[PDB]
Amino acid sequence: KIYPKLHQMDMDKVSRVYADLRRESISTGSFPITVRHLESILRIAESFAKMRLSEFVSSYDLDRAIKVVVDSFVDAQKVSVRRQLRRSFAIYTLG
Amino acid sequence: SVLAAANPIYGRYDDLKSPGDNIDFQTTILSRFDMIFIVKDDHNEERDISIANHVINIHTGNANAMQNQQEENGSEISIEKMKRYITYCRLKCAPRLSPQAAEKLSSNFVTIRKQLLINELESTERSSIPITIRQLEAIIRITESLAKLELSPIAQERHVDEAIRLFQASTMDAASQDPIGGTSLSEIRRFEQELKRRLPIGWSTSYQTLRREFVDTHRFSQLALDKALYALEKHETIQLRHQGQNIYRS
Amino acid sequence: IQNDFDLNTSWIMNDSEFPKINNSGVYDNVVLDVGVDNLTVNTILTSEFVHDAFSNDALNVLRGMLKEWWDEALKENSTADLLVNSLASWVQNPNAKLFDGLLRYHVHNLTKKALLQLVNEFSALGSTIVYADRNQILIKTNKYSPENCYAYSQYMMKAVRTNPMFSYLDLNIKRYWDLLIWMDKFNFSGLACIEIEEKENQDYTAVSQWQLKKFLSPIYQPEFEDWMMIILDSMLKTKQSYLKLNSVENSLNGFSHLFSKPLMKRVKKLFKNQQEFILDPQYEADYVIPVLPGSHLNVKNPLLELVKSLCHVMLLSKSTILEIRTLRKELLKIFELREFAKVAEFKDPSLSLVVPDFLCEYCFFISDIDFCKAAPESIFSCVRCHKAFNQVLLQEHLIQKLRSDIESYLIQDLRCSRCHKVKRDYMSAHCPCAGAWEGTLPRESIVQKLNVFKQVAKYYGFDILLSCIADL
Amino acid sequence: RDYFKVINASQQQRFSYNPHKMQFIFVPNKKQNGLGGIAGFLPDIEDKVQMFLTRYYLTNDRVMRNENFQMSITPIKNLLGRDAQNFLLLGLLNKNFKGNWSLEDPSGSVEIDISQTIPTQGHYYVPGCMVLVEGIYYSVGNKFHVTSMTLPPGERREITLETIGNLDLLGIHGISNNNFIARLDKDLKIRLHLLEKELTDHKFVILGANLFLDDLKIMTALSKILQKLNDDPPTLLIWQGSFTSVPVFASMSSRNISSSTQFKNNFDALATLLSRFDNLTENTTMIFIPGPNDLWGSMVSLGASGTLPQDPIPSAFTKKINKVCKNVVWSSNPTRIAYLSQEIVIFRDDLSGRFKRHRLEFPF
Ligand SMILES: [Zn+2]
């Protein structure tokens, strides 16, 4: 029954995060990031909205989704750069 | 008509790898095709910002409005009207060439054939994307299809130039892209020492004088130009300005 | 042949800009403010195929001339000293006979190379370059107390002087910085001591030079200065506490905890008062946005720019970024805005228009001058001597700069779109590959430059420059 | 006299050209339809791309209209596949990036050969000029072995006009615009016959170049000329050449008179010298033409050659001549005046040395 809707979300935060993920990545490492992951972030946000039986996506759900995606990306690198990337990406998921 | 989508070996194109072993299609099958487009991914963060904004807006919450205005200001037409227009044009028109267009086509074909021979002679292996008479027929058909858009009985230079531009794009993107594939390099080090030794930062020399001196020595003309444009491509401390005469060292 | 126009010559006359280095940030370490003198003479004395080369025979001749000049000036000769002082002004000035642009370009290039070599030498030991210029160099010292940098600074100066390349440099130390908040030449604040003394605690005087404060509403500038003083005092207190205890540095970590709640309450009161008294007719005097040459930002709510500046000055720490971001988000929650909105992004409220190498005959002193960012009572007077400049010379040099800009734009080259190769055909539709030509110099840049020329000519009384523009 | 005008290069009407239709096309003036509040005089990027195309198009049309040529020329690019055959071509003769002489065409470019070239004497073969080339192509390299070079011929005013009727390019009776095109030939003979009478009374006199307003000898000579010219004032008096013997630029001395102030002072004396010649001032109009090293050019070129469409003398430095004399006009370096049936172009610069120094050499 529940179909969430997506209106009041930050355009610039998500766009800048996608730009940052396009940076580093293949330009420094090997994991591929494409436009599919932006839609994945949106889908995870909609799923988190679904879990509350809510018809509209709030900001906290977007924060949870972006935290999950950033953590999953950063926790799959070498041990030489993991701490550096962890402190580099800490500005998007302050909470 | 066949519209085919395919992926190269190893996923991404891997430009550092030779173009010969990134595509597994034989020469015969590629000849029948006449528009080969290699779409590569790139990162500069401005196109990335634009694409992110485009997708974020195209989420159904907003696009459902904006596209409507495209049908209200007359900037675009609906799909069914386009279908009617294409079937009408297919039924009615069938354009034809002109002698000036034929001469331009012949000259362009000879030029591209000679450039292909030059690239093959430098590379010393057979090109993975061939150029044959089928490509000339292809360019002719592209010109005729372009003339067919406006229901013009006769095809002229205005369509031929755009067709030649499209073929140049689809050729320089795939066939003639990095033909070198990355005397050997012993001279390469030997040259690069001489420029640093004899040409300091901020000064410049004429192209003709450097070419003259290095053809006078063992370097010769062919070796100089390739790494000249390579060091320009490196762009760390070599800049071109004022046509092809001022070799500025940045 | 010299009367004929040529591309290389026209490029070598008008490339007179001197680059500089500026690394923003907050430093809890001691910083040495030094000055370099007689750089050009040292550069001259120290150190076929290439067509832009100046005749080395004349260069060696003048080097020997200057060497005997220096030797004679050493042995009690006022005339030789004065002539050596005027040598640089002779080199720059084209009105003097026997002038050549190639020699001037060669000298300038050698001076730039010497300056970068000096920077490299200063970077060999433990040091950090904060700012660099032809006249001023700021160097970060690894130590923490100014009293412990006496022999350190003296030994560094001695080692620099003893080097054969820098034998003729004169180095003077002006100020010692206990704690610095550096973001730009015209925008810094910190605590400084003139010269460290013995057995006595040094006299510390705080300075606050912020041209950014001039772009605020006449009612929020007292708040700006008060809060800046408060935060600087808090930073001093926390650094002193950390030092007394013994990319992270616990000298500053944890300084915003002292004033966060009072700042929040003050921002709430300011917002309420602005909401109540913004549309009143008699209270509209203090909310009028000032206009100053080089300004290009059109803004509505002054409190937003007040808090944006108060947060951007904080954001220079580069080590306590998370705390500053949390405080910024909390401040933005007072407004009905969000963290990553465009309206909540700080920019530079002023443009830049710099005239390079303005000469003071009373000093033979060479420095740039910024017509937009620099405050008055300094455009019209020399930096060292307090002698008034001649105004028609300033206006004439501005006209020269504008005309040179127009010519440089008109003489630009064309670059392809997809590949960045240069156009090598006198006439062709487009690149052999896909893509159309574009110019190296965009139109919007020169349009904005002409706009800032209009603003500058309107702020001061410059009739000749106005007539110069009107003739176009 | 009336019914004549003097126009500069800034206000000249803009007419483009199109090869495929072979007509001149009016272009709207950016001054009239555009705003121009801040910066409207800056040309856009593609103008430098199209300028050589337009020049080549006009030259090719002029060549094709010739009586002799009805033999046919061939494009450069069509020379790729054939050899051992003679051809006729024309294009920009210049130097390539390598350092050899080449011919450029809207289609392509080739390399030239000069070792056995016999020219048509009486022509200054300078790089950058269109030349008709005859020779044999060889595919061993890319060498076009030339046997003769000749500049394209010319045409007269009447035949040039009649192809476009009698267009009002320098239109004094009427002007054209984007909406429509105009023409007129009925009043031309009337104006010709009007010119045939009272033409001796309507005399105009021109002086030499580089007249300096600083030395005493030139002022004495000018006074001697003016005392002779006062009794019989001409119609148009044209002052041409550089009015200051030293180029004006930045002044680095604050102890003596600045260059701009001295330049202003040089014209204030002319206002005094015109006070004793009220007949010439009252009955004759003044024309001033900038030279190589006036205020605007020498400001950046420092007395050397530079941009050709020079701005007129600035109004801030001629605030007394316009009040002393009732008719003074400042024009650009190229200026156009339109009489009743005559059009005049004045072009002040050096040509002999420019053509002599850069003359291309022919082995013999
Ligand atoms: Zn001074």
Ligand SMILES: [Zn+2]
């Ligand atoms: Zn290109």
